[PDB]
Design a protein around this ligand. Structure first.
Ligand SMILES: N=C(N)c1ccc(Oc2ccc(NS(=O)(=O)c3ccc(F)cc3)c(Oc3ccc(C(=N)N)cc3)n2)cc1
Length: 241
């Protein structure tokens, strides 16, 4: 996260860190139920030297604050039993950039570990609304990962503006969130984590999945996010959640 601040301990108890074996933090995820996480499909693709698509290659850390303190009280470590990448995920465009990850054993809910609420299919997160992005990703483009979970406030951008800023690249599954002036943005390694939106009675719903962007916190290059409401039914069908 570029231009954000340190989160307080347990401020985002749905924020999860995914570590690939021997590689440390790779992607974010969100806790949606005792057994299920949401993340971005593009985190779980194989490359010539590592099988990121293999579930047994991962460890999820729940209630994590500091990447250097993975053994802190209240941190829970979990293996994965399954990765379901969206069937329409497109490695070239990042259309349908969403995966569901099945924890090998259920999470234990606690003051540090708690699911984010999921929005109904018909809910719209309107243009201009403030929402939060969180992660351990780069705090500058080309820069280094944050030890301490970062938070930053960004705003939903009108879809037409979004398509125009990033010609031939924005599909209706995607949503621009951040500022045309830059400054606050997610970045490499925040990918897969949630947008948190404070709703009418203060409960936090997931407004998107961190997906991609052109550098980070660049003028006229806001962060692009996989939408959540469009996937409510797909999540129910696959998870029971
Ligand atoms: N098809 C496209 N339009 C497109 C797709 C991806 C892309 O950039 C990527 C690619 C991989 C990454 N992803 S990631 O964390 O770095 C990653 C990369 C490779 C891998 F194998 C696993 C995980 C990425 O990260 C972000 C996310 C958000 C922002 C932002 N809000 N400014 C910036 C970077 N960004 C840029 C463009």
């Amino acid at each position: 996260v570029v231009g954000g601040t340190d989160a307080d301990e347990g401020e985002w108890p749905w924020q999860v860190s995914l570590h690939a074996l021997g590689q440390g933090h790779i992607c974010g995820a969100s806790l949606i139920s005792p057994n299920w996480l949401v993340s971005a499909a593009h985190c779980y693709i194989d490359d010539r030297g590592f099988r990121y698509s293999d579930p047994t290659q991962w460890t999820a850390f729940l209630g994590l604050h500091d990447q250097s303190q993975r053994s802190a009280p209240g941190v829970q470590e979990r293996r994965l039993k399954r990765i379901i990448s969206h069937p329409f995920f497109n490695d070239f465009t990042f259309d349908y950039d969403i995966a569901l990850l099945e924890l090998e054993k259920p999470a234990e809910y606690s003051s540090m570990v708690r699911p984010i609420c999921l929005p109904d299919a018909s809910h719209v997160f309107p243009a201009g609304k403030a929402i939060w992005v969180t992660g351990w990703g780069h705090t500058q483009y080309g820069g280094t990962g944050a030890l301490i979970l970062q938070k930053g406030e960004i705003r939903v951008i009108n879809q037409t503006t979004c398509e125009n800023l990033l010609p031939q690249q924005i599909t209706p599954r995607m949503m621009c969130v951040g500022f045309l002036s830059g400054g606050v943005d997610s970045c490499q390694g925040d990918s897969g984590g949630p947008l948190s939106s404070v709703e009418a009675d203060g409960r936090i719903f997931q407004a998107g999945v961190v997906s991609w962007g052109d550098g980070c916190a660049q003028r006229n290059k806001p962060g692009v996010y996989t939408r959540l409401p469009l996937f409510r039914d797909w999540i129910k069908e696959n998870t029971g959640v």
